[PDB]
Design a binder for these strands. Structure first.
Length: 341
RNA sequence: UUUUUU
């Protein structure tokens, strides 16, 4: 486990051969930490959630967000090293009939809204490439609150394109935007991915360690397999996110009408969507349908600020929110937030 | 709607 191995490595007290090997792995992982950001890789994942149960495991009680250890980043960068190695290997051997994974180049319009939000904030951001963006974003640690930096990171995480698997025979372009590497594929999970199963098959047929067949090298069939595995992949995150949304509703439903103070992260034309860190979820409140006459809303586009007769709301602010679940229709049990006039 | 373990 991670806590036990962390106490193994971080204490020089317990010393078998396995812990010595893990300390050597950590010393190599700090060199990977040296080269890591200098490659141009971004490790800025979305705000996660973890339920913790009760005496029954069917109604979980509390909601906790895990703080990551360094050994997670260690096995991360080792699997990145393995994937880069096998990608260059299959590129050298079978660049016409291998399964590769790309991240397309995003338009700068998705970065320009973030640059406008940084202009409202205390920081300028270069939208040229991932290198200058990551360097100017990592230099933006404000002593007012580091969680404003965290909100900037998750808003940058919101602004990306959808990576996919592709066959090279049918079509060509192999660059990857997110990892700042020229070519990439997945290899290190053949238990839970069929793409890694065909990666193992093509690598075993590549060095001649096992027999390949002509159905394993036909390109159009593979392109169809890449379309199928791209379709199956985007549905799975939809299912997982709907699952955590449903469970979250159950948790909220049995905690009555509790409330928080949250941070506003995105602004609607006539509504605003915020984040609550204590439960760590996203939630929108609409300012158009339960509202007064339209002159109480004044909206700007250069800076998306919404102005009321009392005060103009801005991004990255502590606000007054509540949690109430609606069941106006039994379909789509939805989380409503607040009411103001 | 990258990314690594489930």
């Amino acid at each position: 486990t991670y806590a036990e191995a962390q106490l193994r490595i971080d204490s020089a007290n317990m010393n078998d051969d396995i812990t010595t090997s893990l300390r050597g792995l950590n010393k190599l992982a700090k060199i990977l930490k040296k080269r890591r950001i200098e490659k141009g890789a971004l490790t800025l994942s979305s705000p996660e959630v973890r339920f913790h149960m009760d005496s029954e495991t069917h109604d979980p009680i509390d909601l906790q967000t895990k703080e990551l250890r360094e050994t997670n980043s260690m096995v991360e960068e080792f699997m990145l090293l393995a994937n880069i190695s096998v990608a260059k290997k299959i590129h050298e051997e079978f660049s016409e009939h291998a399964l590769l994974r790309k991240h397309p180049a995003p338009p700068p319009s998705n970065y320009e809204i973030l640059v406008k939000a940084a202009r409202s904030r205390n920081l300028e951001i270069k939208t040229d490439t991932a290198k200058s963006l990551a360097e100017s974003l990592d230099q933006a640690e404000s002593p007012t609150f580091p969680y404003l930096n965290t909100l900037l990171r998750i808003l940058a995480t919101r602004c990306m394109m959808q990576a996919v698997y592709f066959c090279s025979g049918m079509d060509n372009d192999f660059h990857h935007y997110g990892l700042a590497s020229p070519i990439y594929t997945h290899f290190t999970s053949p238990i839970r991915r069929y793409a890694d199963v065909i990666v193992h098959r093509l690598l075993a047929v590549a060095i001649g360690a096992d027999c390949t067949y002509p159905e394993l090298t036909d390109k159009h069939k593979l392109a169809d397999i890449c379309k199928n595995l791209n379709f199956r992949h985007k549905m799975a995150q939809y299912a997982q996110r709907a699952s955590v949304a449903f469970h979250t509703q159950l948790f909220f439903k049995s905690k009555g009408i509790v409330s928080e103070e949250a941070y506003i992260l995105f602004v609607r034309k006539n509504a605003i969507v915020v984040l609550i860190p204590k439960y760590g979820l996203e939630g929108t409140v609409f300012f158009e349908e339960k509202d007064k006459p339209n002159p109480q809303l004044i909206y700007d586009d250069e800076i998306p600020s919404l102005k009321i007769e009392d005060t103009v709301f801005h991004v990255f602010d502590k606000v007054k929110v509540k949690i109430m679940l609606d069941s106006s229709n039994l379909q789509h049990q939805k989380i409503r937030m607040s009411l103001v006039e």
